């Protein structure tokens, strides 16, 4: 609908019930949850491999 | 008190209110848009007599500076008649014709009989 018609509709008519609902597509949602968990995981691997180096050296 | 932001904004000071020592004008000017000046005279033309008879309205030549609110609240003062709606229009003559439509129970033809126009 036109922008100023959105004040008339109810929230359920304007968003789908999902994380980032009605402001991002599902494919790019899942493909962002993935990258988030993966990058924080590699940051944990590197955190480990940091003190693993500092232990010997 | 550390300066967290590098923009010195002007501090807000205190602002008093006018406590004059004498009113400029002595007396408040009387309201020259009276309930009487706001309604000059009616119309007695068969373009408005068919409105009175059929549409149960009245046609007044009101002051040009008058709102539909002032008109409603000044016919409910000069004539004591609740009003359905008001439709104004400025004629090419210059005056502001106003079609006032009375409540369902009130009869225009029978309040124009009263006030004179009939």
């Amino acid at each position: 609908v036109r922008p100023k018609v959105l004040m008339r509709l109810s929230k359920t008519k304007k968003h789908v019930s999902r994380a980032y609902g009605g402001s991002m597509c599902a494919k790019c949602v899942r493909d962002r949850i993935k990258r988030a968990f993966l990058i924080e995981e590699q940051k944990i691997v590197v955190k480990v491999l940091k003190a693993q180096a500092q232990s010997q050296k | 008190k550390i300066r967290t932001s590098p923009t010195f904004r002007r501090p807000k000071t205190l602002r008093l209110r006018r406590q004059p020592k004498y009113p400029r004008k002595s007396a408040p000017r009387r309201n020259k848009l009276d309930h009487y000046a706001i309604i000059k005279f009616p119309l007695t033309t068969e373009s408005a007599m068919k409105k009175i008879e059929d549409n149960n309205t009245l046609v007044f030549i009101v002051d040009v500076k008058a709102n539909k609110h002032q008109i409603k609240q000044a016919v409910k003062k000069l004539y004591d008649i609740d009003v359905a709606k008001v439709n104004t229009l400025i004629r090419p003559d210059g005056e502001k014709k106003a079609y006032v439509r009375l409540a369902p129970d009130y009869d225009a033809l029978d309040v124009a009989n009263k006030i004179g126009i009939i």
């Binding site: - | 550390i2 300066r3 967290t4 932001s5 590098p6 923009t7 010195f8």
Partner: protein
């Protein structure tokens, strides 16, 4: 007894790591024009070679002599506005049924009685806005042999009299009892202002570069000093 929920969450304020905290920036603020003006005029008074006639106002009375000075200059304050009326009344009933020695205020009067040699001690405010009003008083005192001294603050010199600011103050005469304190001050003053007038009339002030640009020269000089300190062996 410790609760296993209250974790310790440290932040990393490294480059690009996390948003810098609400630090203090009173150094980098963009100030209003009047503030920056007076703040860098105080700097021009450190960069410009100040002639000794203006530089002779920085060498001022100390903080211990100042107290005793204003202690003596509190027994000889002028009369108030109310004391003036109450003296006109006590003079009225005096008529019905000498002037005490007091202070003396103002340049036009201090100069005109330093020429008349009437003064016994002159106090001069160190921060007269247009300094031309007291540029000459130092030399006129030294010339007449009047003990003068510069005091820090014309807003503390202005509380002796009952006005906003005063410029100079003069002790012409004092009572008997306070003549000893006056002679115990005139000594420590004349030995500090009139005795060393030769070295006061010669001492230029100012002419000192900002620390940011004196450290860039002390560093280079250090490098060329430790050069001869290290190349000799």
């Amino acid at each position: 007894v410790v609760n296993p929920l209250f974790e310790k969450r440290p932040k990393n304020f490294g480059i690009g790591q996390d948003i810098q905290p609400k630090r203090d920036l009173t150094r980098f603020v963009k100030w209003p024009r009047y503030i920056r003006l007076q703040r860098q005029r105080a700097i021009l008074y450190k960069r410009l070679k100040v002639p000794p006639a203006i530089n002779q106002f920085t060498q001022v009375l100390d903080r211990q002599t100042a107290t005793q000075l204003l202690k003596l200059a509190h027994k000889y304050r002028p009369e108030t506005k109310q004391e003036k009326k109450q003296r006109l009344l006590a003079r009225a009933e005096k008529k019905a049924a000498k002037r005490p020695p007091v202070l003396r205020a103002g340049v036009n009067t201090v100069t005109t009685l330093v020429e008349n040699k009437k003064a016994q001690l002159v106090v001069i405010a160190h921060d007269v806005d247009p300094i031309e009003l007291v540029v000459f008083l130092p030399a006129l005192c030294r010339k007449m042999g009047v003990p003068y001294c510069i005091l820090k603050g014309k807003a503390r010199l202005g509380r002796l009299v009952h006005r906003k600011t005063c410029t100079t103050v003069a002790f012409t005469q004092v009572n008997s009892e306070d003549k000893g304190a006056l002679a115990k001050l005139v000594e420590a003053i004349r030995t500090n202002y009139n005795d060393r007038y030769d070295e006061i009339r010669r001492h230029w002030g100012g002419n000192v570069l900002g620390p940011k640009s004196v450290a860039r020269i002390a560093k280079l000089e250090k490098a060329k000093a430790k050069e001869l300190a290290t190349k000799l062996g």
